[PDB]
Every structure is written in structure tokens, then in C-alpha cells.
């Protein structure tokens, strides 16, 4: 069933599992694999002839996660054109930048449309368009009037890095690497076409489009949408059970939400998974413990970037192996070494830069030579992580390299300290952050978020700490606070909180 291109594979999969459930929008739709399929084939039949849209071309789109937008992605990238999906609360400023770095050649919506985006595009003079689905014996209607071969090597996938110190790096992707990591993915879960999720992540990011619903309709398995486009605490597990889910996968802060979910309002009974994913950010083993508790399924942690079409690494099943915690798991579909700074392999447990080679990872950032140089050498991609390899090849992260706290020569991870943070009994959320200092050049400081109707002081943490971690690893100061800022991705940047702390 395998191909080097998605949408190669992905008509595999239609002819193979045609009456079997693709994509369902809760309470609404219930697409088939051969009915999505012939979808995708009419709206990029319509870009092709209608919209102007030609090989290598990109076309932006800004959606909620609802079916037009999968509908209209997988319709670009078949068309041989280039997808570009944008966070849609991004500000006409934003949007203007994102549409011309990225030269997009068009902007599609939903007919309810998205004001800033279309300002951005008027302003660039980029057409745009809007996709709306109707009945089931209607084709997507499309807002413009009115033998297809994908290459491997053809552009699909266009995103960008966070860009937090630096300028955003464009991200190009390719057929063949979407191709490599939706097999990947379905390779170390097991999908297959009797497997079922539920959508809980935006799909502008690689985590959610592959992991979540890509790497689904490559396995015939099925995919279900919430049904206000965005993931929902209340209605989430509704549908897992309405719509036969067999695993999800979020992001630890997702996974948080949830757990606190199931505190305040307990199913009264929880469907069986298979599995429960965790990805983009360290799962703290407690959380992991919490999940598996809860919920009842093992909880795997993979480890993924933008650069990499999301998987690098993951926990295996346990029907292959264990699952460590505080561990990322084993390299999927790719090679995986740990580098010193002079660019030699390190023995196990032995730090280093975690690097990666595959028909997964990037060809190279568009148009920044620097980068490249810095980033890629013989086909190896620095991640930017410092990790080690355990006796059996499970991958444990240390940090951001940039995030490391150098005490006075000693380096302190602040994913360790999270974690236990996290394990205190009446803290909800918590992150352990680099400040600058006199003595030590730099400090470990920290910001909590207690439990709701618990108090928890300064002391309370350090004395914790202290009784949880060797002394310099302490954090010296203590904000207690009620929030703590997140991505739309939903992951918390460590600079900005300390920042926010610190002057």
C-alpha cells in the first residue's frame, strides 16, 4: 500500500478501504475514504483549470480544523502545489508577512472567511478564494468561476520555525517527506483501517495534520473533527466514544486540560485505546502516571520538530517494547546520532546534540544559506536538543541548548525541575527558567500555578525541590501565579515567562 508520495499513497488507501470511514465532522459529516478521495480529485481539477494554480505554485489556506480545510489541503498538495496553512487569529500584519515570505499565489478560507487574512491578501493583490461543503451528492463548492502526476520532490508542505529569536525560517516540505513520515508513523503505532481519533490539536502545525490526521488516512483508518473546529474539554471525550476512537495524541498541556477534566466532571465510563500519544513538549512522568491511571491506556511520548515533518523518535507499543518515562523512545524510519560539539558520535550516556538524517527531514530553510550551513552537514539536521542515549537506544531529552542553566559551570535542565514541579500535590502547572546572575552567571528560577482552592507559597516549592533535587539544581525564586501563557500549538515558551518575572 506504500508510495513516496502522500497522495500516491493516500489513492491507495482510497481504492483499497473505499467504504470505510475517513473523516467525520461530530454531529455532521461522515466521509468515506473513496468519497474524500473524489472530493480531493474535483476541488484540485477545479484549482488546476479555475484557479490558475500550477506545478510548484503555493496556496495559503487559513481554516478552523474543519473539513474544507482537509478537503482543500490534501487538494493543493495534489494539484502538485505547495500548502501553506496559517494560524487564523493571526493579526493582518502577521498574515501579510507569512503570505509574502512564503510567496503564496493565493489565499483560500471557508466562505465565512477570515477579515485579517483577506486584508493581508488584497493588500498583496493575492486571489482568494473560498471552499464550502454542502450535501453529500454535491461537490465542494469552490468561489471561483466555472493525469495528474505528483512527484516525490514536488513542494506540499510550507511552514515556518516560531522564529522566538530569530526571524521565522521558512520550512519547506515535500511529497516525499510527508510520504516518509506518515509511513513512520503508522509503522511504530500500528495504524490501521479499524482505528479511529479524535482531532484535538490545530492542524497548522505538524503535529495535529500528521500525526493525527494524515498518518490516519494513510493507515484507512478514521478521523473525526470536533464539531466548533478546535479542541474542547467538554465535548471531547463524547465524541472519542460516539465516533469508536481507538488512540489520540496531544501535547503535554493538552493532556493537562483533559486530566483536569476528568478531576472535575469523571466519565462515567471511558472507552478502551490502544494507545495515548504525547508529543512537542517533555511529558513529566507524573503526567504520564496521571493518563495511565485515568484512562487506562499506555501513554506513549514521541519526539517531533517542524524540520523533521514531525516523528524523530517514540516509545514503541508494548507489544514491541516498554515505554520509559522521562524518555522520548527510539529513532522512527530514520538515522539518530548524539554529537559532541566537534562533530563526533557519543557512546551511550554520553550528552550531546541530537541529529537526524531521512527522507523525513527538510531539503533546508528557503533562501538562508547561513542557516543551512549551520544547520545541515552530509545529510545530518541538528535538532538543537541535547539528549543521550540509554543502553537500549531510548533517547532521553536534556533540553534546548539555548535553554540549558549554566550555574557557575553546572548545567541544570529545566525539563527535570518541571517535572518535579509537577509532582507536588497541589501545583497544576509549573516551568523552571534561566535568569541572569552575579555569582553564578546564571540562575534557576521558576513560576507555579496551584490547584484551585489549595495555597501554595515560594517556601512551600523550594522545600519541596530540595527534598526532590540535588541543591544547585534548586530553583531560588518562586513566582506564584494564576496563568501561564501558551502557543496556539499549546506549549509554553521559558524566555517569555521569564521575562515576564524578571525586570
Request: net charge negative.
Amino acid at each position: 500500500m506504500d508510495s513516496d508520495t502522500l497522495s500516491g499513497l493516500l489513492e491507495n488507501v482510497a481504492k483499497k478501504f473505499p467504504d470505510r470511514r475517513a473523516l467525520s465532522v461530530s454531529g455532521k459529516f461522515n466521509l468515506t475514504h473513496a468519497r474524500l478521495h473524489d472530493l480531493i480529485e474535483r476541488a484540485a481539477s477545479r484549482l488546476v483549470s479555475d484557479a490558475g494554480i500550477k506545478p510548484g505554485d503555493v496556496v495559503a489556506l487559513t481554516f478552523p480544523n474543519t473539513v474544507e480545510f482537509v478537503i482543500m489541503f490534501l487538494a493543493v498538495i495534489r494539484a502538485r502545489a505547495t500548502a501553506a496553512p496559517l494560524n487564523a487569529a493571526y493579526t493582518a500584519e502577521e498574515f501579510e508577512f507569512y503570505l509574502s515570505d512564503s510567496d503564496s499565489k493565493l489565499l483560500l478560507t471557508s466562505k465565512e472567511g477570515n477579515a485579517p487574512a483577506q486584508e493581508a491578501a488584497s493588500k498583496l493583490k493575492i486571489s482568494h478564494v473560498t471552499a464550502t461543503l454542502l450535501d453529500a451528492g454535491s461537490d465542494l463548492v469552490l468561489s471561483v468561476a466555472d493525469e495528474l502526476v505528483n512527484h516525490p520532490d514536488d513542494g506540499a508542505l510550507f511552514l515556518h520555525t516560531s522564529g522566538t529569536t530569530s526571524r521565522p525560517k521558512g520550512v519547506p516540505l515535500t511529497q516525499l517527506n510527508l510520504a516518509s513520515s506518515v509511513k513512520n508513523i503508522k509503522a511504530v503505532y500500528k495504524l490501521t483501517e479499524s482505528d479511529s481519533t479524535v482531532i484535538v490539536l490545530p492542524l497548522f502545525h505538524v503535529h495535529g495534520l500528521l500525526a493525527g490526521l494524515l498518518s490516519s488516512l494513510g493507515a484507512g483508518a478514521a478521523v473525526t473533527l470536533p464539531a466548533a473546529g478546535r479542541f474542547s474539554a467538554t465535548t471531547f471525550w463524547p465524541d472519542m466514544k460516539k465516533y469508536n476512537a481507538t488512540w489520540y495524541t496531544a501535547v503535554p498541556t493538552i493532556h493537562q486540560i483533559i486530566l483536569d477534566r476528568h478531576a472535575s466532571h469523571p466519565e462515567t465510563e471511558y472507552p478502551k485505546l490502544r494507545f495515548i500519544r504525547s508529543c512537542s513538549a517533555s511529558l513529566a512522568p507524573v503526567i504520564l502516571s496521571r493518563l495511565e491511571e485515568a484512562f487506562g491506556a499506555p501513554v506513549l511520548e514521541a519526539y517531533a520538530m517542524t524540520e523533521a515533518t514531525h516523528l524523530m523518535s517514540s516509545n514503541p507499543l508494548p507489544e514491541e517494547g516498554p515505554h520509559k518515562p522521562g524518555s522520548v523512545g527510539k529513532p522512527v524510519g530514520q538515522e539518530m546520532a548524539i554529537l559532541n560539539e566537534k562533530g563526533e558520535i557519543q557512546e551511550p550516556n554520553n550528552k550531546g546534540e541530537v541529529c537526524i538524517r531521512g527522507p523525513n527531514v527538510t531539503k533546508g530553510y528557503k533562501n538562508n544559506p547561513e542557516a543551512n550551513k549551520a544547520g545541515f552537514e552530509f545529510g545530518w539536521f541538528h535538532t538543537g536538543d541535547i539528549g543521550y542515549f540509554d543502553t537500549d537506544g531510548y533517547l532521553h531529552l536534556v533540553g534546548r541548548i539555548k535553554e540549558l542553566i549554566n550555574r557557575g559551570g553546572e548545567k541544570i535542565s529545566p525539563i527535570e525541575v518541571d517535572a518535579v514541579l509537577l509532582t507536588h500535590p497541589d501545583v497544576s502547572q509549573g516551568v523552571a527558567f534561566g535568569v541572569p546572575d552575579e555569582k553564578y552567571g546564571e540562575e534557576i528560577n521558576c513560576a507555579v500555578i496551584p490547584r484551585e482552592g489549595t495555597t501554595v507559597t515560594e517556601e512551600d516549592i523550594k522545600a519541596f525541590c530540595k527534598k526532590n533535587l540535588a541543591a544547585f539544581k534548586v530553583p531560588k525564586r518562586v513566582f506564584i501565579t494564576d496563568n501561564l501563557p501558551k502557543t496556539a500549538s499549546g506549549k509554553i515558551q521559558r524566555r517569555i515567562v521569564a521575562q515576564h518575572f524578571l525586570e
